[PDB]
């Protein structure tokens, strides 16, 4: 129930950590880059977004 809450909240609320220079800087516990993708609520807000 907690791993599926990890699977839903990363699909719904996932923010891509690629900087504008195209390099990730969030590093894990062994030193390698954590590569995260864009979720469903970030990929919808690029074209027709409003506030």
């Amino acid at each position: 129930l907690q791993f599926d809450e990890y699977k839903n909240n990363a699909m719904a609320w996932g923010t891509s950590n690629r900087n504008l220079n195209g390099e990730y800087m969030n590093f894990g516990k062994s030193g390698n880059a954590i590569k995260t993708g864009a979720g469903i609520f970030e990929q919808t807000e690029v074209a027709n977004t409003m506030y």
């Binding site: 390099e23 590093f27 030193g31 390698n32 880059a33």
Partner: protein
């Protein structure tokens, strides 16, 4: 080597040289350099003393002992796993991912390893010293005769460039050195009756042993017994 390497001080070599009345202006200062030029050119590993020292690696770097000349093997202090050699050109340098086998690299008074924070044991070779801080030379009178001839060869070369020695005297000294410097090479190299048993076990193997470097070359000369069926 067949014989034992007994140690004598450096003024033994000036008992022999100043028997020649042309070499009487040789000194200890002149004999110290020509002994070290000789020991290094001959390169017999039985002239150096075998020492083992544990040093600690800080950040892919360790501080190396002072009296070292050459490292036989480095190992790890916790495992006993030996380290081979660094073929990497990019050892401790990280990519911007900020990203297998232990290895080492030695240039000066510093050792460059592939491990970050660990103690390593270094089996090296030094010069054996006296009560004084002088080198201590072997007792073998093949070594002492060809060291006598080497110091006589470099001194007579200086007299021949000045013009104070006929060319047939240097040409004879260069000849008599050339034989005794090969005979000294054959003496200090050719294995003993005890040391040919350690080669009889290595050479004769029904199932070949090809990983003695992972150990400390400990079972290089161990007998490979085979069960009888």
């Amino acid at each position: 080597m067949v014989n034992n390497i007994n140690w004598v001080k450096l003024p033994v070599i000036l008992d022999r040289l100043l028997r020649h009345p042309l070499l009487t202006d040789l000194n200890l200062e002149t004999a110290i350099q020509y002994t070290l030029d000789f020991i290094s050119a001959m390169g017999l590993p039985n002239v150096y003393v075998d020492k083992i020292e544990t040093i600690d690696i800080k950040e892919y770097r360790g501080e190396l002992p002072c009296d070292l000349i050459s490292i036989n093997q480095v190992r790890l202090h916790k495992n006993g796993i030996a380290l081979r050699a660094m073929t990497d050109n990019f050892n401790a340098y990280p990519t911007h991912d900020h990203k297998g086998e232990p290895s080492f690299k030695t240039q000066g008074r510093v050792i460059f390893t592939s491990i970050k924070h660990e103690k390593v044991d270094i089996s090296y070779k030094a010069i054996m010293l006296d009560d004084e801080g002088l080198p201590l030379i072997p007792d073998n009178p093949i070594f002492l005769k060809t060291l006598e001839l080497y110091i006589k060869k470099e001194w007579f070369t200086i007299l021949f460039d000045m013009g104070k020695i006929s060319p047939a005297v240097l040409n004879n000294t260069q000849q008599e050195y050339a034989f005794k410097a090969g005979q000294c090479n054959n003496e200090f190299v050719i294995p003993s009756v005890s040391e040919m048993e350690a080669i009889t076990n290595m050479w004769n193997q029904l199932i070949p042993r090809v990983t003695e470097f992972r150990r400390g070359f400990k079972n290089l000369g161990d007998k490979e017994y085979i069960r009888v069926h």
